[PDB]
Amino acid sequence: GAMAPSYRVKRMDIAKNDEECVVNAANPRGLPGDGVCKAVYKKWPESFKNSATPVGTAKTVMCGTYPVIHAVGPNFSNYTESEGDRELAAAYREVAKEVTRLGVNSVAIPLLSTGVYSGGKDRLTQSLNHLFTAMDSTDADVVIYCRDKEWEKKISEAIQMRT
Template sequence: MSTLIIECVRGDIANQPDMDAVVNAANAQLLPGAGVAGAIHRAAGPELADACRALAPIATGEAVISSGFGLPNRFVIHCLGPIYGIDEPSADLLADCYRHALKLADDHGLASIAFPAISTGVFGYPFTEAARVAIATVMSFADGVPCLERVRFVLFSEADQAEFQRVLDEVRKADGGDA
């Protein structure tokens, strides 16, 4: 049985100083953009964009890792989520983002990682469906990542945080209360 702590908080993904890594909801070229990608790049500084040039492009569902530079985190894990209704199968590709990010966290011996709600912004993934995929994937992967102690979902609004928490509680109950 896993001892992984999974939590849902309202906050700024670029201001999670107690996490080893934050996840960037990236574009294929890993460039600064709007939303999460813009916030992370602004906080990390121009060195992040320089480092990302060598890592890009990435395909939908893939993840790569870089230094955190000006962020309070050692690492940024960049994931390219699916554009809902275009990149199919969307649920599998979204789950791949979380699995690949968790694998990178494990490969680097990280104890904590903070995720945004990948693909729910301009990529149009329905929020509750995305929450179900994210939480189910993290919970199913937990036993395979022994060094990981904490996964945090950082949500932008109070309503988003409440919905992720509702889905987390629902999945925990269905799973018998683990995680």
């Protein structure tokens, strides 16, 4: 565990993270995909061996000894708001199980279902709150990666508001 488990946010490529493992915003078929998934494929291509896993689940594959936790958030184009909400919460619970099982002291994590799976909606708050629900009982240092300056501000504010 981390000595004083924390949340942090950084605005940069999750492929350049400084943590002991990474969560991929994966697709169910283990394809190279777009956005976070394509950056992860470029950095850790070996981790996409048998990475396919259903919506609402996480599957870890090692790239050398570095764990890549493939977390499949729902595509809100396909799911109802209600079913999508349930699957998004579930993907993060499976990430918390994997992070715990791996025994890491830190994890780099994107906001699931906020990009091309958002169904063209702003899901920062919805995705972040599910992240907190899952990860709050873990003792890993959590570092959330984003690319948008205003998202960075909002995420930082949401973290600081609970400290």
